[PDB]
């Protein structure tokens, strides 16, 4: 109350000393007295020190303090939001000095990252314009926070943000990924992964502003804090059509993916398998490109010795590629020569029913090519059938006939009767 007194005081030097105090108590590494401060009702008073007529130093501390109040539970954040502090935060980006903008931008970050509605709210307030205007500055600390806040405005796919509004950030974002600053590179990539999570139009917008080429470079960046969101972003782009996928291929994404398949991080290998599977779902030339990049050997090993979540992803990648054998038979002969059959069978006794369905499709494609070759050449046996039997795979396809799922039994039945009569 000695502090609160100096805050509600009319003395100019007292109101600043009191602001400095509330700031520091909320700037503590340990558990900040967030609720004790709100209890004093000093919120709207600090919102009042963010108005044009306040000294540069009183706005700096007032905003700083108000930022660490929004960085708390949704409730502590709503206390600041309803004290009509948002529009005053935005204006401060237009009128405050650098030090002051750094405080207001950060606060807009916590408010936007609290929920899809506070996000839409900050955007309705037209904060995009002044935020993008901030990057005409050279202060790395200011750039970092602005990229993070910008990040939170693109985030959220359930209630998706206004696209005619957030797509405006792309140009800025395309320049940002050429930054040498690690932290900045992290938030720029997150923002881009959010934006890339949309339809074919979004993806194409990310491509038109020329982001793919640098994004691929970032896959081999030193820090895994950069790689994760960059990988996700490159991943979303290949969920697009064949032409869009080709752009990422021409940027050299494949050699980069080969490196990521040996990543000490397990979730990076998983997302790299995922990414490759969407590339093998492409056309003949793209599947052939995956093969040339030497991606199958390390993808086959993962199918046999890795966390079940990764094995699944690897399964899709190889299964998708096998469907390419109809237009180019060497594709399947190649997968087989690399030993995909054993790791494929060994995955038939897994819990997931959709993976089993995808595994069985691969095996059938392999059995089919095996049959065409038998007839084309002068062979007496379907060689891929033997490989499967010797790998104990025929016994498993046999058990699948007693799986409650319909599609599974019906397919496991077609195989047995057609290739193992």
């Amino acid at each position: 109350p000695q502090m609160t007194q100096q805050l509600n005081s009319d003395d100019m030097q007292e109101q600043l000393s009191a602001t400095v105090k509330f700031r520091q108590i909320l700037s503590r590494e340990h558990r900040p007295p967030i609720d004790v401060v709100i209890q004093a009702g000093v919120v709207p008073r600090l919102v009042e020190f963010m108005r044009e007529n306040q000294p540069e130093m009183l706005q700096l501390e007032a905003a700083w303090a108000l930022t660490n109040i929004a960085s708390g539970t949704s409730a502590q954040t709503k206390v600041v939001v309803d004290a009509d502090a948002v529009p005053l935060f935005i204006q401060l980006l237009y009128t405050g000095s650098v030090e002051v903008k750094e405080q207001a931008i950060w606060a807009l970050g916590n408010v936007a990252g609290d929920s899809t509605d506070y996000r839409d709210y900050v955007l309705q307030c037209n904060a995009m314009e002044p935020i993008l205007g901030l990057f005409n500055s050279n202060k790395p600390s200011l750039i970092r926070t602005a990229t993070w806040t910008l990040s939170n405005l693109c985030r959220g796919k359930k209630p998706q943000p206004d696209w005619s509004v957030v797509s405006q950030a792309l140009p800025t974002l395309a320049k940002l990924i050429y930054s040498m600053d690690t932290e900045t590179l992290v938030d720029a990539c997150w923002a881009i992964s959010y934006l890339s999570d949309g339809p074919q139009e979004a993806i194409q917008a990310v491509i038109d502003v020329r982001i793919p080429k640098r994004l691929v470079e970032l896959l081999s960046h030193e820090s895994t804090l950069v790689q994760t969101p960059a990988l996700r972003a490159v991943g979303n782009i290949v969920t697009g059509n064949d032409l869009q996928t080709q752009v990422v291929i021409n940027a050299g994404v494949l050699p980069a993916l080969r490196l990521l398949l040996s990543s000490p991080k397990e979730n990076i290998k998983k997302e790299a398998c995922w990414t490759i599977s969407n590339i093998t779902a492409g056309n003949t030339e793209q599947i052939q490109a995956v093969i040339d990049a030497n991606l199958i050997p390390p993808l086959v090993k993962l199918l046999e010795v890795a966390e079940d979540k990764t094995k699944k992803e690897a399964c899709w990648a190889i299964s998708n590629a096998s469907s390419g054998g109809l237009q180019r038979p060497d594709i399947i002969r190649y997968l087989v020569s690399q030993g995909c059959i054993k790791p494929l069978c060994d995955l038939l006794e897994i819990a997931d029913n959709r993976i089993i369905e995808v595994t069985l499709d691969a095996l059938e494609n392999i059995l089919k090519m095996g049959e065409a070759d038998k007839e084309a050449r002068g062979l007496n046996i379907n060689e891929n059938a033997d490989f499967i039997e010797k790998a104990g795979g025929m016994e498993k396809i046999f058990n699948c006939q007693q799986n409650e799922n319909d599609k599974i039994y019906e397919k496991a039945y077609k195989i047995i009767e057609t290739y193992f009569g």
Binding site: G109, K157, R232, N278
Partner: peptide, 19 residues
């Protein structure tokens, strides 16, 4: 074949404390 969107969602930190 089939291009699959991601099933698991990803994002950075929702909020940050200034020091």
């Amino acid at each position: 074949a089939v291009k699959r969107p991601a099933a698991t969602k990803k994002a950075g930190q929702a909020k940050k404390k200034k020091l």
